[PDB]
Amino acid sequence: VLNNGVQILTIDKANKKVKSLDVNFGNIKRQYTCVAIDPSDTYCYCGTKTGDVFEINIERAIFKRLGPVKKLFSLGIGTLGLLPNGDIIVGAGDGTVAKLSIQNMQVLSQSEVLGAVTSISFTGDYTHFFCGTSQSNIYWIDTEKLNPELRNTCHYERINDIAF
Amino acid sequence: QHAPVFEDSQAATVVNKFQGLRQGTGGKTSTQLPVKQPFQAPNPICGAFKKRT
Amino acid sequence: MNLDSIFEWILKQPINYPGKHQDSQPRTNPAYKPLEAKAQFHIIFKATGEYIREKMLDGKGVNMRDFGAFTFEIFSDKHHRIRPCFVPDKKFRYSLARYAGKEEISAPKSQHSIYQKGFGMMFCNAGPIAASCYLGKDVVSSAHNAFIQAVSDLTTLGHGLNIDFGFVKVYVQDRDLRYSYNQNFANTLNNKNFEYRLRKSDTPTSEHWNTTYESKWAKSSLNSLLKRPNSNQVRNYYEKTLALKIMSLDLSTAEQTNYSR
Amino acid sequence: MREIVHIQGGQCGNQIGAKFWEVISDEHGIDPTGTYHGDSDLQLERINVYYNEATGGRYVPRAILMDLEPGTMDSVRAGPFGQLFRPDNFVFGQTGAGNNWAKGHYTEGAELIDSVLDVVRKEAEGCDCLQGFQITHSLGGGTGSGMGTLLISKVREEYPDRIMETFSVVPSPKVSDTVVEPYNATLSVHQLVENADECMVIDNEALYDICFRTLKLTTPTYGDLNHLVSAAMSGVTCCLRFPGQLNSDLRKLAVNLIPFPRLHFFMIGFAPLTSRGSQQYRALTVPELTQQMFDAKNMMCAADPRHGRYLTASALFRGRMSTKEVDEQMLNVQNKNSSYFVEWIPNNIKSSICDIPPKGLKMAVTFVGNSTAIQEMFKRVAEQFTAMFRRKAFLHWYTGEGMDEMEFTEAESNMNDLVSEYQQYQDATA
Numbered sequence: 042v043l044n045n046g047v048q049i050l051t052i053d054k055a056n057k058k059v060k061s062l063d064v065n066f067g068n069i070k071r072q073y074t075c076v077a078i079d080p081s082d083t084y085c086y087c088g089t090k091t092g093d094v095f096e097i098n099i100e101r102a103i104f105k106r107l108g109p110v111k112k113l114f115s116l117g118i119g120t121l122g123l124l125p126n127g128d129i130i131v132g133a134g135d136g137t138v139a140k141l142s143i144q145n146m147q148v149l150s151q152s153e154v155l156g157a158v159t160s161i162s163f164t165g166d167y168t169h170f171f172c173g174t175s176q177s178n179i180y181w182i183d184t185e186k187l188n189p190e191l192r193n194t195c196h197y198e199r200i201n202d203i204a205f
Numbered sequence: 206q207h208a209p210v211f212e213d214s215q216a217a218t219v220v221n222k223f224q225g226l227r228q229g230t231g232g233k234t235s236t237q238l239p240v241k242q243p244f245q246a247p248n249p250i251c252g253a254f255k256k257r258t
Numbered sequence: 259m260n261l262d263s264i265f266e267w268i269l270k271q272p273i274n275y276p277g278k279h280q281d282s283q284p285r286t287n288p289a290y291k292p293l294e295a296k297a298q299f300h301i302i303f304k305a306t307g308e309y310i311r312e313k314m315l316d317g318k319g320v321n322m323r324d325f326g327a328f329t330f331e332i333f334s335d336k337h338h339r340i341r342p343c344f345v346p347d348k349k350f351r352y353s354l355a356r357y358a359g360k361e362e363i364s365a366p367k368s369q370h371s372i373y374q375k376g377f378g379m380m381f382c383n384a385g386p387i388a389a390s391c392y393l394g395k396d397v398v399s400s401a402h403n404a405f406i407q408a409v410s411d412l413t414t415l416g417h418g419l420n421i422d423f424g425f426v427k428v429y430v431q432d433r434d435l436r437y438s439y440n441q442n443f444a445n446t447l448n449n450k451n452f453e454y455r456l457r458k459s460d461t462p463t464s465e466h467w468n469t470t471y472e473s474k475w476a477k478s479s480l481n482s483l484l485k486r487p488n489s490n491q492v493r494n495y496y497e498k499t500l501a502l503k504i505m506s507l508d509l510s511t512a513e514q515t516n517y518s519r
Numbered sequence: 520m521r522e523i524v525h526i527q528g529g530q531c532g533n534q535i536g537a538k539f540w541e542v543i544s545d546e547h548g549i550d551p552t553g554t555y556h557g558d559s560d561l562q563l564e565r566i567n568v569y570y571n572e573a574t575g576g577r578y579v580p581r582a583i584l585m586d587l588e589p590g591t592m593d594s595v596r597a598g599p600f601g602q603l604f605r606p607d608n609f610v611f612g613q614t615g616a617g618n619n620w621a622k623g624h625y626t627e628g629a630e631l632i633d634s635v636l637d638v639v640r641k642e643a644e645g646c647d648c649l650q651g652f653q654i655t656h657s658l659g660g661g662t663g664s665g666m667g668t669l670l671i672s673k674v675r676e677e678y679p680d681r682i683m684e685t686f687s688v689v690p691s692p693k694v695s696d697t698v699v700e701p702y703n704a705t706l707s708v709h710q711l712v713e714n715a716d717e718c719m720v721i722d723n724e725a726l727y728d729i730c731f732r733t734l735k736l737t738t739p740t741y742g743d744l745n746h747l748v749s750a751a752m753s754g755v756t757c758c759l760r761f762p763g764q765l766n767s768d769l770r771k772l773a774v775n776l777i778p779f780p781r782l783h784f785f786m787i788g789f790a791p792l793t794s795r796g797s798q799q800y801r802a803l804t805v806p807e808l809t810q811q812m813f814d815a816k817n818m819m820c821a822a823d824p825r826h827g828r829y830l831t832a833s834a835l836f837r838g839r840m841s842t843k844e845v846d847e848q849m850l851n852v853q854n855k856n857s858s859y860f861v862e863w864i865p866n867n868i869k870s871s872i873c874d875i876p877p878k879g880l881k882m883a884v885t886f887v888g889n890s891t892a893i894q895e896m897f898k899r900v901a902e903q904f905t906a907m908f909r910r911k912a913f914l915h916w917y918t919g920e921g922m923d924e925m926e927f928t929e930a931e932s933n934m935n936d937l938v939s940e941y942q943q944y945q946d947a948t949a
């Protein structure tokens with residue numbers, strides 16, 4: 042994920058040279074931060090600072106769709122994950138959890154979380170995953186129903202002094 | 206086109222306990238048992254605003 | 259309407275169609291995770307679509323209880339001509355307004371109901387479908403009863419229903435109704451091997467008690483729609499995550515430090 | 520007030536209802552023209568329970584007759600008191616079931632049942648305040664055992680709060696007139712235990728035995744059997760229709776008689792029944808009534824109640840009697856038979872009084888008893904069921920129109936579990 046766009050790299054054991062190919066977009070200069078890959082590896086879904094999730098097939102450099110319609114997340118795509126069914130869970134910079142089915146990009150359920158999202162970790166069987174904010178807050182987010190629950194909260198940064 | 210795989214999508218909140226075949230509403234004639242709600246035909250909206258082709 | 263627009267349409271209004279289909283239901287087998295209300299409904303329809311095809315592969319014909327009836331015609335003569343017709347029910351017929359009441363199967367006056375009109379008419383018991391989906395008999399019946407209420411949608415102007423669920427591709431216009439059958443499926447019917455299925459005396463009448471239903475069901479086409487997960491893995495993960503989350507409340511307590519390593 | 524409606528299906532149900540309505544009309548003094556010819560006001564004080572009023576002063580029973588063949592109702596309409604029934608209430612099929620439970624529960628019956636369920640819903644909506652629904656049917660016939668129980672399920676799942684009871688005629692293997700009793704009997708019981716708030720079982724073998732041994736009349740007939748079962752039926756709701764020292768409707772009986780949801784199968788008795796030669800000799804007293812009531816042979820079921828322990832008993836007395844002697848007799852019977860009454864439910868006998876006796880009699884007694892002796896019926900039914908099922912006999916008739924062996928296996932397992940849970944409470948001790 043180059044700041045300009047998506048690149049696909051080819052490494053071959055025969056020669057040390059690396060082959061670089063660029064994914065092209067028609068009159069699109071959105072900047073890309075995060076990326077995730079289909080388990081089938083046919084497509085890769087990449088975030089954007091604007092708030093929409095683009096999806097590009099690996100085989101062709103063309104992009105198939107824009108992303109969420111009529112709605113943007115207002116601070117970019119912090120974290121991105123995929124369920125086995127293909128539903129994509131996306132975290133916004135302002136603090137927001139939403140899931141998109143592989144259909145028209147419309148959210149099945151939406152919820153908000155305190156602080157900027159920084160980590161999403163799916164558990165085995167892909168249920169009830171863990172979330173980590175930018176404000177040092179640990180949250181636990183259920184699947185198919187986005188209800189934020191705080192397990193433990195941590196200090197933000199630079200404790201200066203303690204009193205009793 | 207694309208469509209999510211419908212067998213793999215999963216519901217987490219609902220629990221997996223199964224009521225089984227054995228049950229019994231006979232002898233349970235309390236006044237607070239729920240009653241079936243019949244289907245109702247929707248409001249007919251007709252076509253006063255559809256396109257005329 | 260593409261058999262899915264119906265799904266969102268019926269899911270949109272719960273007050274109009276209240277039932278167990280509106281929400282997810284626990285399965286009978288704990289090894290399987292639950293589905294969504296919409297997803298389980300599609301799975302039920304796929305199971306029914308396969309159930310009807312494997313029943314129609316035999317001389318027995320299946321009907322929906324309020325939505326048409328799947329039949330076939332025998333003109334008669336190592337061999338009969340078989341042609342499917344799919345007559346509609348009377349309630350579905352009333353909703354149609356411009357549909358001409360042409361007869362596609364002919365029966366005498368004593369032959370009045372579809373059960374004796376058809377050669378091998380079937381109840382379409384939802385028990386095998388519920389077993390295959392590992393779902394409840396009551397909820398699958400509720401799903402059928404909710405979906406057969408397509409006449410309400412049809413009565414509204416327009417709203418052509420293009421419902422497929424497999425071999426039969428049936429289309430509903432404003433008030434006109436037509437259908438098509440899979441060409442390969444039709445050719446299987448004319449593959450002229452049905453002389454054995456038509457007669458009930460082909461079996462030596464010995465294996466009825468020798469062969470067990472588990473063995474017969476294993477070789478049946480049904481139950482192969484969904485993959486079988488690893489039974490050990492599923493509850494390993496289940497109780498594992500359950501313990502993890504039930505006592506993941508506190509991260510501060512250590513009681514075992516490992517300073518150097 | 521607190522009225523109930525009647526629904527009968529199948530040949531057996533039609534025959535039972537025909538005599539029951541004759542009995543109730545005779546007791547109320549209603550002529551076969553629907554014209555009032557009683558002598559007391561009490562015959563009109565609570566007439567709304569069973570009869571609806573029409574213009575011209577005539578009455579119509581609120582009974583719904585259903586069948587898959589027209590012969591039974593065509594024959595019964597020509598009988599005495601046959602004009603009372605409203606002709607619209609007759610719903611009939613043109614095919615028949617042929618003693619097949621699958622035919623009588625799946626294919627033709629479900630497409631027939633829309634009209635009968637609709638007329639039932641009009642009947643229920645019209646009356647002021649429902650009390651419940653009563654059904655009479657036999658489990659040995661396919662069409663009756665199918666439509667009866669399916670309508671039970673439908674009406675129960677539509678009016679979950681109203682009381683619901685059925686007089687079920689169970690097939691005894693001694694007198695079996697068909698070869699397919701166990702199959703449809705077990706299938707019907709499988710969902711009957713699920714939905715029936717109250718079920719009361721009647722045996723043709725026991726009817727024959729009581730007719731031969733007690734009445735000692737030469738030629739028993741189905742008319743006499745209908746008369747006996749109709750008297751038993753009327754004894755249950757007599758107190759609901761007439762005053763008394765302690766009235767007890769079906770709801771009170773159900774509350775007092777079932778300790779647990781899944782034990783709602785009952786056996787009933789009627790007294791007095793005196794032989795031909797001895798009507799002039801026997802003396803009608805409370806002790807005589809109680810001793811005949813608790814006699815095993817007076818039972819209308821082949822189950823011997825001394826093979827098990829009574830969970831509970833309930834008695835409805837009709838006539839003018841002081842409650843002290845009745846209570847004394849019940850207490851004496853309970854004390855003298857401690858072996859046959861399970862101990863963790865002391866004083867398990869309910870008594871109720873209605874001061875209006877049956878016409879021509881000064882006193883009468885109706886009995887309903889919940890005891891563990893009924894288990895042997897289910898045990899023998901399961902025995903014959905598995906005996907005919909292990910060879911898959913006659914299974915093609917059922918499986919050709921919607922049946923799989925999974926349903927039969929589930930019904931067998933459920934009834935076996937019913938027997939087991941019915942039998943642990945017999946051995947339970949405090």
Ligand SMILES: Nc1nc2c(ncn2[C@@H]2O[C@H](COP(=O)(O)OP(=O)(O)O)[C@@H](O)[C@H]2O)c(=O)[nH]1
Nearest residue numbers: 529530531534657659660661662663696723741
């Ligand atoms: N009490 C009584 N029992 C009957 C009568 N007719 C038939 N039965 C019993 O019912 C059983 C057969 O029931 P069936 O006629 O097949 O029921 P159906 O199929 O619903 O008409 C026999 O074993 C008889 O003992 C009747 O008029 N009165």
